[PDB]
Amino acid sequence: AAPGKPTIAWGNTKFAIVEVDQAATAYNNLVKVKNAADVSVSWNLWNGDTGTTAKILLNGKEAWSGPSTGSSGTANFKVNKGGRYQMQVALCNADGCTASDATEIVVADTDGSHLAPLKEPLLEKNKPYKQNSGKVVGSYFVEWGVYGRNFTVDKIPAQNLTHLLYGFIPICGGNGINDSLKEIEGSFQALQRSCQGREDFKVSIHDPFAALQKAQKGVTAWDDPYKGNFGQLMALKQAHPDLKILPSIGGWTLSDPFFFMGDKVKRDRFVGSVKEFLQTWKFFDGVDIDWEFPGGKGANPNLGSPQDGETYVLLMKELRAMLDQLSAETGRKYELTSAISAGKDKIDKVAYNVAQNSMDHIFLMSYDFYGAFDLKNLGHQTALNAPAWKPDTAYTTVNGVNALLTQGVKPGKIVVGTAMYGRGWTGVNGYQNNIPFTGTATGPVKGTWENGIVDYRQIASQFMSGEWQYTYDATAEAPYVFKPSTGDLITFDDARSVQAKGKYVLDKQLGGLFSWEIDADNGDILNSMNASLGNSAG
């Protein structure tokens, strides 16, 4: 005498608590945060009594009920928790309940709770390591790498990292605020489009297609609410719940807005937009501030002020206070980090001994010491120590670490930078004693993607055979290759120089190692980062 068993009607099964508008280019229209997903289910009864009550069950728990008044019905209700649910329709009367077969529905949320884990095999030369050293092992993944570089989130050797940094999250602003972007074709216009209707000095997403909509492994179904980099990072967090995924704000071309944050009106708006961003995108674990640089001498020759050091310290303090409030609301731990210049000249513009009290980690950019931006003075771009031919070299890793320690920075805060790329010159000439670095160049070396820069993958693949000389400088702890016929000279990190940096980190009780940029490694560099810090293989 119980009701007939209903049949769930064919229809959409994927819903979203944070909805992405699929026909919008402005961040304010693209992202719609709701308190709950609007879910809809219909059913038909092809045999029997329709009962007197109809219920929608999610994993057995009623989400909706109403009178059963005909052979077909529809239910609209709200679901406030993300996940994949076994949904049933049940028809009930005084003599019993009859539940349909289950249909899986998706209620998407930005922690990835609706997503299958993105657990992918290691590629190229990457070998498995356990994160049991207690040291930082970090790397940058770049938003634009999914195009020409064809390097997507499913290719990250995520088990071999403690920290994954996402470069880069922009700060809204047009003329005079993001002028450095005008040097990249279409890039300034892209940010203005993303920021339409949005206040200057709030964060946004620079390339929303790459971030949210490009089909990628695990998020290829047209009705998947989140695709692109963010969708995959949510699924990666499901596979690696202890991985720290941090949005990096700034970098070389997106740092101009920081120079205006001495105005607390702008600084407050920025910090508040970061809080909203983390509440919106729950898979991120904090924020990384990559201001290049307090005091100027970044991409924009017209920016930089003596107040920048005070602004930096105030910004870190206020970001920390915001993250502590967010941590209290969610129960989660959030991290505040910053990538900083390793040059003593720039380090002494900031009181890092004060700012460290707000920060979890300082990512010391101990690379780019030399490069094709200077054709007259050549040197190791990421070396640990000075070379034998110039022991007074200003830009070395040790000089940057020592400058921080001299201010009073605790060694455990300091994460040493390694390069997964080389910088190089062409036409090097006029050098002495077989040391090409004592000469001068006529231009940049032919690069993988841009002049003067070469992926480590390509260095190991193409430039360690043939006419290329190879030398490991054991005084500086730095490899380099040189082709004398053309004068091509590339300075980079290899497994052995990374080994020296890791041993140095352990010896000086520093925080760990990090790298730029993950797509450029073939595995050798990250392998050595893990091994040198004492992570066990496996």
**Residues with a known catalytic role:** 292
- Reference 79, options 16, 9, 8; nearest CA is 16
Rounded least distance, CB 494 to ligand 4QU, Å:
19
Q: How far is the CB of 378 from ligand 4QU (least distance, A)?
A: 19
Helix (H, G, I), strand (E, B) or coil at 427: coil
Q: What angle do CA 401, 407, 413 make, to 5 degrees?
A: 55
73 or 250, CB closer to ligand 4QU?
Answer: 250
**Closest among 336, 312, 314 to 324, alpha carbons compared:** 336
Q: Look up residue 275 and give its amino acid.
A: K
Q: Residue 205 and residue 533: Cα distance in Å, rounded?
A: 34
Q: DSSP assignment, residue 273?
A: H
- What per-residue string of b and e applies to 113-142 under the rule 16 or more CB within 10 Å gives b? bbbeebebebeeebeebebebebbbbbbbb
CA atoms within a 13 Å half-sphere pointing along the CA-CB vector of 474: 0
| Burial (Cβ within 10 Å: 0-12, 13-18, ≥19) of residue 509 | exposed
Pick 290 or 521: Cβ nearer ligand 4QU: 290
Residue closer to ligand 4QU by CB (options 51, 247) is 247
Q: Which is nearer to ligand 4QU, 39 or 526 (CB)?
A: 526
Give least dist CB 161 to ligand 4QU, A.
15
| Residue 348: partners with Cβ closer than 8 Å, 6 or more residues away | 403, 407
Nearer to ligand 4QU, 16 or 191 (CB): 191
Kindly state the smallest distance separating residue 445's Cβ from ligand 4QU, in Å: 16
Nearer to ligand 4QU, 109 or 308 (CB): 308
Residue 43 DSSP symbol = E
Minimum distance, C-beta of residue 118 to ligand 4QU, in the bound complex (Å): 24
Rounded to an integer, what distance in angstroms lies between the CA atom of residue 387 and that of residue 438? 11
Sequence letter at residue 71: S
Summarize as ranges the residues that interact with ligand 4QU (CB under 6 A): 140, 144, 168, 184, 187, 251-254, 290, 339, 365, 516
**At a CB cut-off of 8 Å and minimum separation 6, what does 191 contact?**
170, 172, 173, 178, 181, 204, 206
Shortest Å, Cβ 477 to ligand 4QU: 20
CB of 248 vs ligand 4QU, minimal distance in Å: 7
User: Whose Cβ is closer to ligand 4QU: residue 180's or residue 399's?
Assistant: 180
DSSP assignment of 355-381: HGGG-SEEEEE---SS-TT-SSS---S
Question: Of all residues in the chain, what percent are helix, strand and coil, respectively (each to 5)?
Answer: 30, 30, 45
Q: Which residue is nearest to ligand 4QU (CB)?
A: 251
* Nearer residue to ligand 4QU within complex by CB, 39 or 254: 254
Scored b (16 or more CB within 10 A) or e, 43-74 reads bebeeeebbeebbbbbeeeebbeeebeeeebe
Measured from the CB of residue 219, what is the shortest distance to ligand 4QU in angstroms?
23
